[PDB]
Amino acid sequence: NVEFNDRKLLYEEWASYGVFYKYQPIDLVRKYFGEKVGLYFAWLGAYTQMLIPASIVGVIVFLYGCATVDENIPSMEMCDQRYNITMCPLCDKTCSYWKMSSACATARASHLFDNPATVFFSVFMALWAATFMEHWKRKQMRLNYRWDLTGFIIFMIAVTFAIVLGVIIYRISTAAALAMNSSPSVRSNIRVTVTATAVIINLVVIILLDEVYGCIARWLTKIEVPKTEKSFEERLTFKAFLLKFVNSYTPIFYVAFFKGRFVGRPGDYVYIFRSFRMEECAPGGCLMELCIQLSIIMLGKQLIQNNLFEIGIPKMKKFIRYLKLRRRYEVDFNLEPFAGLTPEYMEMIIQFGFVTLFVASFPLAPLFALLNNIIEIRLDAKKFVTELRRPVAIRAKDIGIWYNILRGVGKLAVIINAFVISFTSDFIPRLVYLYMYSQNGTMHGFVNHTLSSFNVSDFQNGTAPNDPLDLKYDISKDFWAVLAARLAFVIVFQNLVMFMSDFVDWVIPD
Amino acid sequence: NVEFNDRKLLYEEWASYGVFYKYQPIDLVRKYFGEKVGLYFAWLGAYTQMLIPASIVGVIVFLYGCATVDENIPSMEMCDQRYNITMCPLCDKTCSYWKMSSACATARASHLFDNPATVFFSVFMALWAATFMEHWKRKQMRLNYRWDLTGFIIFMIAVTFAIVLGVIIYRISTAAALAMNSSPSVRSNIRVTVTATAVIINLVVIILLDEVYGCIARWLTKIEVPKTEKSFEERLTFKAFLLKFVNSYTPIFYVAFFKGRFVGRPGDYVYIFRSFRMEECAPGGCLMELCIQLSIIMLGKQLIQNNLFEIGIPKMKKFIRYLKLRRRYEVDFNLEPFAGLTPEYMEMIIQFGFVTLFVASFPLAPLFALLNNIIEIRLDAKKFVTELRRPVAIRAKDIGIWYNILRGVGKLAVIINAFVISFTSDFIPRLVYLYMYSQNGTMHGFVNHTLSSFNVSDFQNGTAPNDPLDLKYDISKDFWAVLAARLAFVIVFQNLVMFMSDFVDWVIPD
Ligand SMILES: [Ca+2]
Ligand SMILES: [Ca+2]
Ligand SMILES: [Ca+2]
Ligand SMILES: [Ca+2]
Prior knowledge:
The structure is a homodimer of 510-residue chains.
Chain A: H1 2-11, H2 27-32, H3 36-70, H4 77-80, H5 88-91, H6 103-107, H7 114-148, H8 155-165, H9 167-176, H10 195-203, H11 205-222, H12 232-258, H13 269-272, H14 288-305, H15 307-316, H16 318-326, H17 341-356, H18 365-386, H19 400-412, H20 415-422, H21 428-434, H22 448-453, H23 460-463, H24 467-470, H25 479-507
Helix pairs in contact in A: 3-7, 3-18, 7-19, 7-25, 8-12, 9-10, 10-14, 11-12, 12-17, 14-18, 17-18, 17-19, 20-25
One calcium ion binds at residues 303, 306-307, 347, 372 of chain A.
């Protein structure tokens, strides 16, 4: 019914602004596009429906930490005046009050969720991800039943990856190049949109850099010469992912663990509380999650930015054919062949890496990924009727070639956030005990404000340099206190979660 | 050929003291006993052949640490005079020289292997175990090919386990009951055979306690009423193991981590170096591995002690029938039906738990398990011809019901020893750095003898109480130094090994 299959997909697949408002059609795609193309959406369909429960919990989190501080303002004023020492050696009557508590307005949306909301939420995602991956494993068996009733050389890349890990250099350059663009020496508007430049300065850059590799790995496999032609994508995707994986997440890891650390600068409290970009960004504090929130914020939303290119790039090629034009398959000769399925999943799993891996930075991470998918489903299936004049109807099944690859990213989901979730909200649940050991417990966690902050910082240059207090040398050893505690979490976390996650694919897959 | 099948198994299966001296027969059992009974031995066959390479490495270890100290005596005299302070506050002119270095003769076979030999060897076993489990996974496919060419309610147990974990109490009782038996207040002969009493006092006890559960879980499943009759053993074995698992390994965990720790006793160096069983076992030191070596030593060898009961218990029932006797299947009416396959594997996996789980205490652990198997194979198959007059010839395949269960124990193999391998040989590889930081490295690890030992002990009551030195309160914080390091190992270990082990079932199973 091409008068219908078009229009039924023309008309039951052009919601294109939000939901269809009716349902989600699957089986009919299985008749028109075959098995493979349809089995994409049936995955992309399940990927959305599972975000909803976890997405909503995000809004339940923001409402938590906000309303956990919106009503009795518990950790605002005590938190709005812990930074007000942060520039004391910097004041010295000269440049005294510039940004001492400037972190406060920036400290809120971080310092609002950490212990109860973030440290919780990751445990649901990892438990969720196993729920998801276990769910799809079975739901794939369902549609597998319907069709099953109706089925009648290597070291060269190792140098290439090390090439990619030099991309950290590339982020640093334009990060150093924020000065030549606007140079905002302010607190209200200069903090945000200063880094957001180099982000958008850079986050554009990876985009053009992305399809570079697609011509790279495509030929870089040809040196391998895979015997079975069908297994070419295996050596293709498996190469194509790892490239694009570390191509994308790498800046975040630089802004996740490495940026704050690795800070060697002598000179004590006389010499520390000023030496920071020549005192024009934040003499008080960094609050790296803000940089970590933001840079994911774009990447969560830049999946919409580049999204229009998915419709814009193909229609833009019409300018080429139309230009040659003035300067039933008859008209069908003037549209690109499909040749594009792995980019379809590939857009998703680079999205899936954000939902699960970096999930203790901001809990709303599922939510932005849910907004795109409603567009992502509606854009793509649009692109199959609107564009892609030649469906192959390959009519294979069994998406497992990705099922490991998506599942593997689930396997990373526990270590990474574990360090994220450990090294940012674990001064507090043990700093109850150094200071408030006598009669000050969980109702007295608002006591370590000036005490824990009386020193240089909280990080590696936070506890070591305390010698001129009383006399690095004789005092950097309380550093060993927490750095066991940070560690002690992970050995508690990944073991439980990897076991708790072991529940889900233990009774549910059967 | 019953005139041959008997005699061929009568004669090619009564080596019964050592090897057959010829070969190992498998396929013929597959003809006589069928598929199931034979597929046991084909497992038990592979379980031995894989111990040999790992067994030998054990002897290569003892030879290592011994000959690493047998020739230049490196860590004997320096180690024979670290304990010679251990009773200094205990001497005080009254009861001075009793057992100050008594640990020395006991310290040798422990303090001989630790850093290079033990910390190595576990990495091979875990890598070995995955090699084994990966090997059998494929070798099972081999014999699977031959036969495949020729195939033409729950919370109640949770209370029961908690009942079992009270068995730690049971070990403590007769452990307290060593005084009423001989009471050896000596160092040469009193140290060993004092604990060995309560071991043999207890290690007998679990034996009679074992088959108690077999009547327990057998009925305790009947309340479940499994629908499929064949899946009864599943709810049977899976219950039967976990009971017998924690029934056996539990004393070791008490003597592994919990015994040394949990020691709260105030009074400083004036009050510490004596208060130990009223000063009659070892005022110097514990060296818990000795207790840990010994109690495994019996259990490695008690698989031979109870072994003769496997032949002794059945023939002992002949005293009952013969007594009624004087006080071709004709004579066949007077022998017990088989009804015993799960105990067959069950003897093994309780053995396998010792090879892999507790493998950093003494590396020879595979070796004692290899001596039994040559007897275990020859005893059992003897028991099928000699006894068990009624073979069923069930003629199923596919041992996977245990393949998880044996593999699961492999999964525990990495955490447990990791703490064993961490909390016993990791003062040393970082105690190079507190004391010998200037010009004393790996060639100067013999410098921390008196220094690291100058304090109370090395354990939790080893570093905290140092206040009367200079002034628990002000000094228990170097405790945080190593206790990060102990932790830092595990988060390094189980991740690598679980990945390194991930290699083996990644190219080899295919
Ligand atoms: Ca996108
Ligand atoms: Ca797309
Ligand atoms: Ca035995
Ligand atoms: Ca036996």
